[PDB]
Subunit: 241 residues, 2 copies
């Protein structure tokens, strides 16, 4: 079983990748397989249960709710384990909103200073492990009343744009911005999408699974186009590769 580690910031990011990896690429959640990942090997806070997705001979272990000082501890433990051959991890993905801190590549690399690292095409190679940092939100969502914040919600907003949902409203975006007394954030648009799709769930993360889940069998070519225009296909291709 090939082991890959995927690190995201929160539940919202986890769901986004989960619905794509399951519904589009055919991955499934691990069975009753609930092995207490030894904090001594992976370096994750006690009581944390990662999401394990599998397909064929590949196991994707996704984790979130890390922290600004936990990511480095996770990478250090895992890399310390691989060095001793204690883990089979062969690929590590680290994704975060572009508008967060400095560039994502420089960020990940600042944690690998004491390690021998060789670079390739978007891949950081160290100790036989390919590390793929990735910034979410590299695109331009051209909406008059929406602030240009590069993050997960900006991409999801663009998908709504292509789906024609932002045009179906617009009057609402204008009205909301007027009442708010400022331009809308991509997160506010996520709340407009909830109303537009008559979403009755508690969490936006749930909405992303529902919304993208239906588009896959409703207008699969549209979703593919979105993933391609936002530069998400190559990343996804690597995760399942």
């Amino acid at each position: 079983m090939r082991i890959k580690l995927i690190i995201v910031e929160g539940k919202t990011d986890e769901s986004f990748f989960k619905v794509l990896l399951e519904k589009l690429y055919g991955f499934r959640e691990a069975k009753k397989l609930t092995p207490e990942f030894p904090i001594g090997k992976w370096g994750f806070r006690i009581g944390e249960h990662p999401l394990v997705l599998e397909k064929d001979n590949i196991a994707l272990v996704i984790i979130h709710a890390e922290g600004k000082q936990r990511i480095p501890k996770v990478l250090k433990s895992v890399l310390d384990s691989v060095k001793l051959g204690l883990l089979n991890v062969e690929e590590v993905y680290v994704v975060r909103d572009v508008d967060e801190g400095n560039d994502v590549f420089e960020w990940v690399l600042s944690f690998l200073r004491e390690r021998e690292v060789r670079v390739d095409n978007g891949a950081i190679v160290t100790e036989g492990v390919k590390i793929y940092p990735y910034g979410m939100g590299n695109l331009t969502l051209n909406e008059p009343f929406v602030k240009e914040k590069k993050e997960l919600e900006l991409s999801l907003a663009y998908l709504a744009k292509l789906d024609g949902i932002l045009e179906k409203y617009r009057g609402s975006m204008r009205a909301l911005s007027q009442d708010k007394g400022d331009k809308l954030t991509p997160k506010d648009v996520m709340h407009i999408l909830s109303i537009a799709n008559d979403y009755t769930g508690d969490c936006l993360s749930g909405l992303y699974e529902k919304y993208i889940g239906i588009m896959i069998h409703r207008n699969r070519e549209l979703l593919i186009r979105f993933l391609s225009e936002v530069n998400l296909l190559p990343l996804l291709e690597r995760m399942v590769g």
Copy 2:
């Protein structure tokens, strides 16, 4: 310790009650102590961790997402355990939106077959346990663009109104309605509230805790007045004390 069981439908309902019970009545969440609730006595599902709030000599056990078909299963267990003297439960609260099914009183009553029953102060008494069936959302939200759906969100929408939020907007409500091609549901308004308060979290349940928790600090009387006009005070005062 005196134990009271509170049964709600979902996380949103659990947060709403939790913020009031903690921030308004001084209740605190049970220590690290995680006393595995013996299913044989409570009738809860496998890996369920109910919220335990405590103060003085009263323990409030709140559960949600139990299942429309498991509620009676839970009641039977608890009631039988009380008859046998294995649980110190004296009151059980069952909260459900008015919208769903039939009258909450009949709904609960239909779960108590082969039980000697007696009604006292609107409560169903059996096995010495006071069962309080309560319908959430019993009020009239006078908003031309919002459907009259009696539920947790309708009450939340009313609190937003008293707070002057729905007024500050409305222009947005009008626009949202026009683009949607129908009146806004109370749950739709909840998303406008996220925008009006610049809520960045993933779940609306988290917004209720934040929004109410802060109100308790900036305008306590407004919340108390709200709780009174929606007739939530007598229920809360029963749960506590």
